[PDB]
Amino acid sequence: RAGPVTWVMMIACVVVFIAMQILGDQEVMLWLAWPFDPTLKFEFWRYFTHALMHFSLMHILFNLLWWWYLGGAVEKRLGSGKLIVITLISALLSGYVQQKFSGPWFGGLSGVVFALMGYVWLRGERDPQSGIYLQRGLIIFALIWIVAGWFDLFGMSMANGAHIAGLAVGLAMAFVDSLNA
């Protein structure tokens, strides 16, 4: 749990979130969101910094909770590098698919989070010796969580492309990772 990359991510999300409370959501979005304009396509950070933005205490706490719990496990059991790679691929791919689904106005770490969910479960399943796993007791809630976004649970506009893309990506990485060693 006490991993550097785990905490460095939690720290950035809290910095950025606080920045969002001072400046306002939209003002941070104009700089951190996925490129809305192909002119902006060379502002490379935007492919990753969308993961840093949250729009409610609930949004961020719920994300950081999962991230601490799942990110921690991967960092501890598998190193900081494996975590970073998972975070960068899934922030890049789930941003990418989410932009296609509903455009560039989104953010949150849930893309990376479903990738961690997908990864920890598929990896604990195929490579038990890797010392990580996900309670069936959570992959439920994961499945409810994803399908609840499909129905926009009580007006909650969820990034549906991000969740599935992220989920898929984690499963691919864990499957590939569970063939070596």
Partner: peptide, 4 residues
């Protein structure tokens, strides 16, 4: 906005 959409919440990932």
């Amino acid at each position: 906005v959409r919440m990932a």
